[PDB]
């Protein structure tokens, strides 16, 4: 299975938030390792991993994420245990306050790989 949560994003935030920053944010918040995978689970697009950082400087809307997109964020260092993967639903809401990017407080445990 997978952990699940909703990200509350303002519209202006999807349009300004850089992918590189989004990755750091999710990694640190839920304690993933350095090597990670970020996939659009909606349409199965590998958007970022520890080997494909080419869209680093693009914003979230520039890589075609939007309201209702589901992102799957995985642990790719995965020696023996891994940080459990999480599926995050992007809730782009009007009118959330400007520059809102609220990540859900979810429990993401270590599990056997």
Instruction: CATH number of the domain at 111, please.
Output: 3.10.290.20
CB 19 within 8 A of CB 111: no
Resolution of this model in Å is 1.6
Domain tally for the chain?
A: 1
For CA atoms 52, 38, 76, 103, the dihedral sign is positive
Q: How far apart are CA 57 and CA 43, in angstroms?
A: 21
Rounded-to-integer distance, Cα 85 and Cα 1, Å: 8
Task: Give the helix ranges, DSSP H, for 1-113.
Answer: 11-16, 19-30
Residue spans of beta strands (DSSP E) within 1-104: 3-9, 36-40, 45-49, 70-75, 81-83, 86-92, 101-102
For residue 89, give Cα distances in angstroms to 9, 42, 77, 111: 10, 10, 24, 22
Structure tokens at 20: 């590189």
Method: X-ray
For 111, the enclosing helix (H) or strand (E) is: strand 110-112
Domain of residue 69, residue span = 3-113
């Amino acid at each position: 299975k997978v952990c699940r949560g909703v990200i509350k994003l303002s519209s202006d935030c999807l349009n300004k938030m850089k992918l590189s920053d989004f990755v750091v944010l999710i990694r640190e918040k839920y304690s993933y390792p350095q090597d990670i995978s970020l996939l659009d689970a909606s349409n199965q697009r590998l958007l970022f991993d520890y080997d494909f950082e080419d869209l680093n400087d693009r914003t979230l809307s520039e890589i075609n994420l939007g309201n209702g997109s589901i992102i799957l964020f995985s642990d790719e260092e995965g020696d023996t245990m891994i940080r459990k993967a999480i599926e995050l639903f992007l809730d782009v809401d009007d009118e959330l306050p400007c520059n809102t990017c609220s990540l859900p407080d979810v429990e993401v445990p270590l599990i056997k790989a």
